[PDB]
Amino acid sequence: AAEWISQQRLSLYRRSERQELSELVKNRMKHLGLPTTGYDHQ
């Protein structure tokens, strides 16, 4: 498994802030129970 997360390190390190913020709200909606869909600029 050490060869599998070696790209998880390379991907989660290069994610843009827009992806980091989008991953935050979706994760919270998952935690509070709201559907993750419907979330998806001025």
Chain positions contacting other proteins, by CB under 8 A: 1, 5, 8-9, 12-13, 20-21, 24, 27, 31
Compute φ and ψ for 19, nearest 5 degrees.
-75, -35
The smaller minimum CB distance to other proteins, of residues 13 and 35, is found at: 13
Q: How far is the CB of 37 from other proteins (least distance, A)?
A: 19
Query: How many angstroms separate the CA atoms of 42 and 36, rounded?
Result: 23
SS3 for 4?
coil
Residue nearer to other proteins on the CB measure, 18 or 41: 18
Give the separation between CA 27 and CA 6, rounded to whole angstroms. 23
- Of residues 32 and 37, the one with the C-beta less far from other proteins: 32
